[model samples]
Target: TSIKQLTLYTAELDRMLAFYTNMLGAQHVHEQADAFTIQLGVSQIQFRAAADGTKPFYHIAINIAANHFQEGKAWLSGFGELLTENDEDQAYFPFFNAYSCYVEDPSGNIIELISRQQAAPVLDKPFSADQLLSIGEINITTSDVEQAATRLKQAELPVKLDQIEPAGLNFIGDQDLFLLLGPPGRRWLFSERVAVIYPLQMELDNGVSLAITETGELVIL
Candidate 1:
């Protein structure tokens, strides 16, 4: 269920690139007049230019070393203030034995750095962007979540959770990699940012190409 690539639309291409490259030390793999790519361990995030007056952002979860949750949070906090909820900037998940912290990049994309046991290997060194294991979760929003979930099922993305709800966000695929199928209007945790129907696409390592067009239409490419 690994993501080979994730393409996101960004109006602030320059600032987005600077956030990943200069601020986070992500490797710049490619560049063009309207797009660029950054390497994050096993996944590549490609930011494409969007037309003026457009604001695009995403809730992307990235894996970090199992033992570096606090360290990673500190590292990210050094760049800017961490987004908080009720004065708490981190979350605990006993299910995955994970802890995550949220931060927003220059383009206002909510990036979640999650440290999970047995996910990314524990390293002896201090935390850094190089320790970013891969993209673990990406949000796929639409008017009908089940409709989009069907396409993922056809592509062999099994439902990870069984208590499916028509109006709630569903988790699909295996642990360590997942696509959050849900409807718009739900608030992303830790902020007022609500789910949006923006154009997003992912090249899954399972030979599946998943996408949602700007018009909020789900499709498989």
Candidate 2:
């Protein structure tokens, strides 16, 4: 229930390359004339050139140790502006019993560094970029939640909770890895960005490979 690789779109590949490598300190894995990939802990995130001039953004979350939210946030603040809610840049989720802070990349992607209180052991040292554990969550937005959910079900992506609501979220996958299923116009917590369908692809460690079309159709690749 973890991400192996995620491919996304970006209009500015060079700007993203700099931000992920120089700013976030991610390892440069591979590159091409129109795309590049970076290693994020156990996950690889690749950005392809959106040559058609479409700018796409997605909500992605990374996991840290159980007790390193502040230290992680402190380190993250140096790279980009931490998005604040009511003057606070961090949040504690009762549902997951986790502490999380939000940051936006150059492409307006809502990046979250989240630490679940029970997910991993605490570290006694300072937090660094390597402290990132894995890709904890990735959002899958669409104009039709039920339609997407049905496709996801056929693909064997088990919903963490069986319930699906039109205006809410249905978290698919489990054990801290999730594909957030929701419709457009649902505001993401801790940021002003609302959920929007975009062109993206992800392969999970659980033997699932899926992608969403630019027009919001889910495709099992």
Candidate 3:
């Protein structure tokens, strides 16, 4: 899936833009001077001028090409710092053998860069960014996975609850989504996919046209 745009609020528009397009090699798609959009392959990130920029929040994420871990790592290291075993002098939750990192823009909002490789194809080496494919899976973290599955069934997401194997709660998306439910105590915290934990927000299957409210609610537009 190709991401049309990922909107984010920030204090330092220029700094964030530079970090994204200049530092990370993303290209500028369109600009209104301060607020602009940067393109990375099919996905784009938009930086908006925030009224109060101190709110540490998360926005959205972009998917890199498959099997391009090493190259993507090299590309990211050339610009942004990685949140890794060497950074905090130790490792912690969510930062394991995965090729993931985080960046807090001038707006102080944390952004996560990661690879969602649950059912994606395996890669022995780095692949070209131009050839990367994005298959987004909404991470579901519920205190009760079975209850969540029932709730989802009631909502008609068209998924069936599979065995809660060593990989946590698993649900098969029906012609729409490939969803994973994190069992209790296994919440997946991401830096890039940011939204205040106030109301609730969800992405649509199309991967574009976000419907979000200031109260922190979302709809798939």
Candidate 4:
């Protein structure tokens, strides 16, 4: 399933809108007094104004061309700054043969630029926001990994990887589209924020849609 649209909440909608459009150069799709949507190639992200006392944040990953890892990294460095671990600017995942660089937005949302070697082509010209392939992954944090996996499986979205454990992280859908399901309080990589329940609604190209409630319930539509 390929992600088509995602609705997220933010307290500072203006800051987020500027960061995504001016800084990252994402295409502005729609705008309203309190909300707006941006184009990330095949995917669209809609940000709404958060209600009082709501802290809405999540880890999202955007896929870049397979052959453009170096270019993507260099291009990303020109932004504010890349999130680092042990003073390293990037990380490699052997399972997917991928490289990833992380950055935080004005609202403190962790954003990832990933290059999966087997997925697609690298850009010939200099890297830019146009090279983003899709919203490759959305992290869904729950208190019960098994229960969450069971619910997603029952919805006809089977686990695509062999890494599903009782309390470990699980991937649902293919490499191009998946949910990073795990337990809450697990700190996001290169950030101080811990995973917490937040409301999220999204639709995918494969005719699957789901919502994560503010209390961490997964509702498949």
- Write down the RMSD of all candidates, one decimal each: 1.8, 1.9, 6.6, 2.0
Candidate 2 lDDT over residue span 70-147, tens digit each: 898888888888998889889998877888998888888888998989876688887888778888888888777777
Q: What TM-score does candidate 2 reach? A: 0.92
Model 4: per-residue lDDT, tens digit, 1-221? 67889999998898787777775564445678879998887898889988889878888988999888888888777666899988999999887678899888877888888898887675677677677788988888776677778778877776643467757677776767668898887778888898887888888877778888778877887
Clashes of each: 0, 0, 9, 0
Cα lDDT of model 3 by residue, 1-221, tens digit: 33345566666777776666565444445667668876555555566776663543442333443355546555555555554434441222232233444544555444444454443346666454453444233344444556656655555556455654423746436321244544433323433333233212343335434333443333344
Clashes of 3: 9
**lDDT scores in order:** 0.81, 0.81, 0.47, 0.81
Better of 3 and 4 by TM-score: 4
Question: Clash pairs of candidate 3?
Answer: 58-194, 59-194, 65-132, 68-126, 68-127, 111-191, 111-192, 112-191, 112-192
Judged by whole-model lDDT over C-alpha atoms, candidate 3 comes out at 0.47
The 10-residue segment of model 2 with minimum total lDDT is: 22-31
Index of the highest-TM-score prediction: 1
Candidate 4: pairs in clash: none
lDDT string for model 1 (61-95, tens) is 99888889889998888777899987999998786
Q: How accurate is candidate 1 locally (lDDT)?
A: 0.81
Q: In model 2, which regions exceed 4 Å deviation?
A: 26-29, 160-162
Error of 2 at 110 (Å): 0.6
What TM-scores do the predictions have? Answer: 0.93, 0.92, 0.57, 0.92
